[PDB]
């Protein structure tokens, strides 16, 4: 079981959470993680949602290598890139890299796929793993070596076709946190500083961590404009004749998802797992001791499941001999499951069960007849309570101020910024270096600029340089 | 269009049919190919359905690591293993390996998590791509230093269990390949010379190319018995407080599969896709060079959508219906239905097959059910056609001198074999030196399905009495 406290030490509590809930299993090369099938399955539930979300898109899936030759992956980064230089004993005539993402895998062959409006769009996405040698603290989840990921690369013939597809797939980003993980995140542009260099605009959605005051980027969605096209030699002929060059995006999303998940709704029993995405909706326990009316019992669970199951609600019997009932509570209690269902000797009797539901550990006793309306209404509601009171806890975390005086006072209660600014380039790495050496007695930066912009009353001031504030842009610690 | 004739060079037939169906991009690092589309949908097709079926068994997915450690790695390969050494400009305090498989990787969790009987049976299993520095050519699907695959690793409590996991995973591979791929295989064991030195018995599904004459292993299922559970110390307590080694079993299956369909079923116009696998099993092309016919044929797709039909409309603009029929041949797709100015005034539609040529008339009403009627009519043609010339490439024999003119027929061959150890090396070198005057005859399995065995029968090659018969052949 559980034993850190969650608002104590925040890293040991989600250790703990991932381990003793059979999420993850440590191992030998560092910043690497065993995703055992307790977390495996999560992954599965929303690579499944966002995966039939982009095919009623068009878009469609392959796969590319995981290899890029030195000359064309070298056509900031540098550090990160795996490379392999020998085979058995042998070195290869060539090093060769392992993808960190695959831009320079792809593209060239863009270029060739590419010849006239008839090509167009081309939309790709792949389901695949990706290596970077990460110079951050590793964390399971939130920032690994190796992580699995999609990456969606598409052409169009123009900017308002790829700028559209953008904003597509960012809601779609929206729904796989909000509607699957239940966990909120705010919309938003990158600052000139954050974005994809590669890229015209980066936009993105945005999380956030009480425990240690941290945002978090939950996603990633980016209008690249031609520049990679005319890198790669991405052109196409018009319906007149002449020459064009495509207008790109590309967007990925990670496991880090469900890191933010586990932080998000887990509690000091460890796991909670939002309905929609939990493997086992409800577990069936029953109770047997001292061989009381033992087969009767397991007979009604079996009724139970099958009447459950008809109405799509997922559920497992643990009818395991050599665990104790009490075992099994604390058991799927850490692993999160959203409903348990305990039958034991008098409940047999009354045609009812008791029903404990983690999020809260309210109970409820419940008709064998009401039970799956009921548990359907139980789900829906664990669901829409997670959402919310995530909800809350991220607007309670956010400071709307004025002047630069509020920030470090703000960040000691670990809370984010929301602060009128000039947008100029400067000023970013002015207000890291500036907070850094004041938290060092660290850095804030730019987390978006939300899509959702409060008003801004004429003649406002930036809050750190006084010049006229164009936006407001969200600021924090963060990942 | 393809231009090389599949019997007269097959190697040219290959490359042409997967390059100009758009299922394969060369690529710059050998042996590594970009799989478009149009041959991943295929993949995706196959790894739902088994995944669906393993977890019915209770596998459960996973995703360990593709790094491992040198020392892990290394507690006849070693070529073949890729080795990372720096990370950008800096060297690694001892070089990484990119996982050929995960034995090393898995089985010291495995001991890890196995304490007691009531933590078996263990069975997991993951979808990944593995790395193989190949000495063989690469060939698009079949060999790969880069290939996708499925790997599971199960542990029980018992050595019966295990089997019976092994020959249910088997079932399913022979599912895999002939109700999904439509093709057909053939379930035996590894004799004692091929079978993984790892394990105490590999079964596996054997399949065959009759345009070369070699067999070609489809995937494999092995009884691991008790040595890993030895070596990696997987053991557990059994009721009695016991200290038993944990019986194991492990299994994969490649991307080689879409290879292996691609072969079976093309033809001299290209690829012929089994309609349970292809991601458009009927296109729709308006006979055109106005909306009454583009909007007719929104209305079919809608209508034919309802029955699970998968459809796309080829409405491109410069492009004859003559070009676009052959474009959609050489992709396989195995349903045309044809729609112009005179279809459209008699309510009907011309649907042509892609296996065998024929044309269906059929009215607007009768599509749906005609459709679903053609697609399991060629899916079962395409198999039986199949399994006809597999069973055409496989000679039965008595003696040693039969075997040369059999594979030089293209054929494989069944023979009474004592299956001695020492027998299937020579019999490699005999066929080697011969073939001479790759060329090297090995066993592919010993079916399952045994033909009869006449009482006092002698082996083929050491004229000792005869155990099974063993099927031999070239393979890849
Ligand atoms: N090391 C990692 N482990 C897990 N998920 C990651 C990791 N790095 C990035 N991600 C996630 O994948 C999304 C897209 O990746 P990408 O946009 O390439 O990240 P990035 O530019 O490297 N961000 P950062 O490393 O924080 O400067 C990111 O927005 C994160 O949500
Ligand atoms: N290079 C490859 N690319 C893709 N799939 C492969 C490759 N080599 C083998 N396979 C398939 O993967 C299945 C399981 O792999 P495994 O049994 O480990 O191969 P193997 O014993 O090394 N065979 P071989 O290389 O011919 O000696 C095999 O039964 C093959 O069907
Ligand atoms: O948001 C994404 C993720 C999926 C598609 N690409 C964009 C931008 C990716 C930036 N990025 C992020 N990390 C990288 C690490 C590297 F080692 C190298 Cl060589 C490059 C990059 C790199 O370009
Ligand atoms: O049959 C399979 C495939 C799926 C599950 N695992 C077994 C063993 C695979 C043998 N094999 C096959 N190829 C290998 C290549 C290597 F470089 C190294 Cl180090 C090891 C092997 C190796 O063990
Ligand atoms: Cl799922
Ligand atoms: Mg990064
Ligand atoms: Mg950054
Ligand atoms: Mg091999
Ligand atoms: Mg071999």
């Not at 309570?385 to 975390?397: D, I, Q, T, V, Y």
């Amino acid at each position: 079981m559980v034993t850190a406290k969650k608002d104590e030490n925040f890293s040991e509590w989600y250790t703990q959470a991932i381990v003793r809930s059979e999420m993850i299993e440590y191992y030998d090369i560092s910043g690497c993680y065993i995703m055992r099938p307790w977390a495996f399955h999560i992954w599965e539930k929303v690579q499944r949602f966002f995966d039939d979300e982009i095919k009623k898109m068009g878009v469609e899936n392959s796969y590319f290598p995981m290899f890029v030759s030195r000359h064309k992956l070298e056509k900031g980064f540098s550090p990160e890139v795996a490379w392999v230089t020998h085979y058995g004993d042998s070195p290869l005539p060539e090093k060769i890299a392992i993808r960190p993402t695959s831009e320079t895998i792809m593209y060239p062959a863009y270029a060739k796929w590419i010849r006239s409006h008839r090509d167009l769009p081309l939309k790709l996405n792949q389901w695949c793993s990706v290596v970077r040698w990460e110079f951050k603290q590793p964390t399971p989840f939130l920032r690994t070596r190796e992580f699995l990921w999609q990456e969606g690369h598409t052409a169009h013939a123009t900017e308002e076709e790829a700028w559209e597809l953008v904003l597509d797939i960012l809601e779609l980003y929206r729904r796989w946190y909000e509607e699957c993980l239940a966990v909120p995140v705010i919309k938003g542009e990158k600052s000139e500083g954050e974005k994809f260099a590669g890229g015209k605009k980066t936009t993105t959605v945005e999380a956030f961590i009480p425990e240690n005051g941290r945002g978090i980027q939950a996603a990633t969605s980016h209008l690249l404009g031609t520049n990679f096209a005319k890198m790669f030699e991405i052109e196409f002929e018009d319906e007149e004749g002449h020459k064009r060059l495509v207008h790109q995006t590309s967007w990925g999303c990670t496991t880090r998802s469900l890191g933010v998940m586990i932080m998000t709704h887990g509690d000091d029993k460890g796991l909670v797992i939002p309905p929609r995405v939990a493997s086992v909706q409800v577990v069936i326990i029953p109770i047997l001791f001292k061989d009381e009316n033992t087969g009767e019992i397991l007979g009604k669970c079996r009724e139970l499941k099958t009447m459950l199951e008809k109405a799509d609600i997922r559920v497992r019997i643990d009818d395991r001999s050599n665990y104790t009932p009490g075992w099994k509570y604390n058991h799927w209690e850490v692993k999160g499951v959203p409903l348990r269902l305990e039958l034991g000797p008098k409940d047999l009797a009354k045609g009812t069960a008791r029903v404990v539901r983690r999020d809260t550990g309210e109970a409820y006793q419940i008709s064998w007849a009401d039970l799956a309306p009921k548990l359907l209404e139980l789900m829906e509601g664990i669901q829409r309570s997670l959402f919310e009171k995530a909800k809350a806890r991220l607007h309670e975390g956010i400071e709307k101020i004025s002047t630069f005086d509020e920030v470090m006072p703000a960040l000691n209660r670990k809370h984010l910024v929301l602060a009128p600014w000039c947008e100029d380039p400067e000023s970013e790495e002015q207000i890291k270096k500036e907070t850094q050496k004041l938290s060092e007695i660290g850095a804030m930066k730019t987390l978006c600029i939300p899509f959702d912009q409060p008003p801004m009353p004429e003649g406002t001031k930036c809050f750190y340089t006084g010049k006229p504030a164009k936006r407001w842009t969200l600021w924090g610690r963060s990942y």
